Paper text:
The cysteine desulfurase IscS is a highly conserved master enzyme initiating sulfur transfer via persulfide to a range of acceptor proteins involved in Fe-S cluster assembly, tRNA modifications, and sulfur-containing cofactor biosynthesis. IscS is a highly conserved, widely distributed pyridoxal-5′-phosphate (PLP)-dependent enzyme, with 60% sequence identity between the enzyme from Escherichia coli and its human homolog, NFS1.
Therefore, IscS prefers an “open” conformation of the Cys328 loop, compatible with sulfur transfer to an acceptor. We postulate that the longer Cys328 loop found in IscS is essential for this enzyme to transfer sulfur to multiple acceptors. Easily recognizable electron density in our structures indicated the presence of the PLP cofactor as an internal aldimine covalently bound to Lys206, as previously observed. IscS is composed of two domains.
Residue numbers in the entry:
A (entry chain B): -5 to 327, 333 to 393
B (entry chain A): 1 to 327, 333 to 398
Write the structure that this text describes.
């Protein structure tokens, strides 16, 4: 095959770390920057440079709200999903603290949630970190058992960024609503990938980013429910912008880019995620019959774009080196993935795990190249430990 | 020319096309779009290189080590981080903070939040010209004072504080000194290897770089420390977690590179225009300069006009994109200088920049002269002005 043979290397399989900006998004962004464009500050209320800028912000705010079934007034712009996570959890925790100081989250949450919760523990909040099941799913009966009268907040993400597992955010939402608990979802990896309708879903706070959906880095949003009303304390002060919730200049060009990505995503999501899901199954089929490999997560109920695989009887660092033709991630920090460790894998298996994440430039030929490279590489490397021979005995 | 004339560069500036050109290379599939935290592949390594180059360009303008530069989302974030970060870090030493009534709201609203948290804040009144009396700063400084925040250039009236002298007083007493340099960076010279400032805020969009990126300088010698306000992975050496927006960072870097080359020439040109503007309007009766021309940024002119209504003034000048600093409450900075509410209302900030010409200044002088004349012709207030304006207003 012509594509397969003239294959540009390394192959990008790390869309979960960041995505390339869609050419249409970039083109929109370019009109909101120079003296010839709409470069005004939306907060300049006294002249047309400002009004024009405010208008482009309101369009983008509607574009974002339309994807996720919210009212634009529920969308608070932030500098990214890290900030959204900080704002949601510290904002709600501080606002509702006289009602209770107990927070429940998952051990497999992104660090923006975990380190936030750890900071709140310093401040006197008490935090339950729930252990997931081996597949990454939180046991909903364990969640209910942890819920108390002084529980103010639960934070559990839609799609796990390391392993792609999908939590039942609707059921968790129902549990929280019935008890009067604020439910925050980190939807950074699910927005524009799985359907989200906040007019139906019982979620109070939701974090999104631009750069996991072909928008620019350094912009995000937090959805803050108007009905039934949830409040949060601003963490960023300076003029009470975004209805008191987040002060600072609105980076119009960034906001316009995010809105455009979310407009694109609503239109192209269903065809593209079907295509991606086909490609992920194609990848897993090719590699599942290598002996002693393990899928981390859920094949049928996972995100269409993430495949996290553990390879037994090989050494983690030489694995990444063997796969240098691919841009991938092991989740290493050398600490292995705290997420894999939470599922209960030993450190060495956790080290020799690879997240493959797919996106809109990913082809069938890249997948086939990947399959043959993984197969070759695992065979070659296992020929280097006696443990593999000492597996092929007992 | 083109109407309306942009004279609101202090609100935001247009991105320099050199800056935009660089940013465009760090975005799409055929450019450098990777995440610099992606440590295991070249998409990350090449993004990390661009960030390091940008960080070096920023540090070079201001006389710092790049390791002292912490990236943030803007000067609002840098201000919040510096003050809350230093106040929380040093709170066992004391809980007293001194700032100025005329600071940006990013400082003032931050200090008000810290008051809720049990900190004590002194807000110093400036002099009628906007300058802080250093004798009153000194009088306010105690054994339990941990932090002072006094901006370099005021965004509303352009007044320049003696940040070097303030820095000396703070260092001599073991007090942390934070400077909001959002309006001075790329306009006045800053050399942090000489200047005794511990924390310094800057932005990209006040010097022809993109909105939504900024930095905080955090001194490493003698070492200053702050508590992170943004958690999630301990990035920027623990001080600010989150993904590094590489195209934004590259734009800011490039804006700061350009500013180092072009600053001296451009600020001389702007000071000329600022002076040209003031000369043309100073011989209108009953107008007041807010600030101090001698201790004032080269690109800002803030003027109050007596005997006109503020709302009518700004509409009369619709040929200009300017600011009156209203919110309708008048400018809190002007109220802090001592002006009555009406005079504060009928004040205009003219801020100049890269595209401002002598033709635009001349048009502005004429427009202003004619407009004030017209306005004072309505209402017998101006007509009375003669009759012995009956006391107190
Ligand atoms: C990427 C990621 C974040 C951080 O997002 P930024 O916009 O880069 O700060 C938070 N949560 C999840 C699930 C993520 O994948
Ligand atoms: C504009 C400005 C800010 C706010 O900076 P952003 O980058 O827009 O958040 C803070 N301080 C001063 C003096 C400013 O003029």
């Amino acid at each position: 095959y012509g594509v397969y043979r003239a294959m540009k290397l390394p192959i990008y399989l790390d869309y979960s770390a960041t995505t390339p900006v869609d050419p249409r998004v970039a083109e929109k962004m370019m009109q909101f920057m120079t003296m010839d464009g709409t470069f005004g500050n939306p907060a300049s209320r006294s002249h047309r440079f400002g009004w024009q800028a405010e208008e482009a912000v309101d369009i983008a705010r509607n574009q974002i709200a339309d994807l996720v079934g919210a009212d634009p007034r529920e969308i608070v712009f932030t500098s990214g999903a890290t900030e959204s996570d900080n704002l949601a959890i510290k904002g709600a925790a501080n606002f509702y603290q006289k009602k209770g100081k107990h927070i429940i989250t998952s051990k497999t949450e992104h660090k923006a949630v975990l380190d936030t919760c750890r900071q709140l523990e310093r401040e006197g909040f008490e935090v339950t970190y729930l252990a997931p099941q081996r597949n990454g799913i939180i046991d909903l009966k364990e969640l209910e058992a942890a819920m108390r009268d002084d529980t103010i907040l639960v934070s559990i993400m839609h799609v796990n960024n390391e392993i792609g597992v999908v939590q039942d955010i609707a059921a968790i939402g129902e549990m929280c609503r019935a008890r009067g608990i604020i439910y925050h979802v980190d939807a950074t990896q699910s927005v524009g990938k799985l359907p989200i309708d906040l007019s139906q879903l019982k979620v109070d706070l939701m974090s999104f980013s631009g750069h996991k959906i072909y928008g620019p880095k350094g912009i995000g949003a937090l959805y803050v429910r108007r009905k039934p009303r949830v409040r949060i304390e601003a963490q960023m002060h300076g003029g009470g912008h975004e209805r008191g919730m987040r002060s600072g200049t609105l980076p119009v060009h960034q906001i316009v880019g995010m809105g455009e990505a979310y407009r694109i995503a609503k239109e192209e999501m269903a065809t593209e995620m079907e295509r991606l899901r086909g490609l992920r199954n194609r990848l897993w089929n090719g590699i599942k019959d290598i002996e002693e490999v393990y899928l981390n997560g859920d094949l049928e109920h996972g995100a269409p774009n993430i495949l996290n695989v553990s390879f037994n009887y090989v050494e983690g660092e030489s694995l990444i080196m063997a796969l240098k033709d691919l841009a991938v991630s092991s989740g290493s920090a050398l600490e292995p993935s705290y997420v894999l460790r939470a599922l209960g894998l030993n450190d060495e298996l956790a080290h020799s795990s690879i997240r493959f994440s797919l996106g809109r430039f990913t082809t069938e030929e890249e997948i086939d190249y990947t399959i043959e490279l993984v197969r070759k590489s695992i065979g070659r490397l296992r020929d280097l430990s006696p443990l593999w021979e000492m597996y092929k005995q007992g």
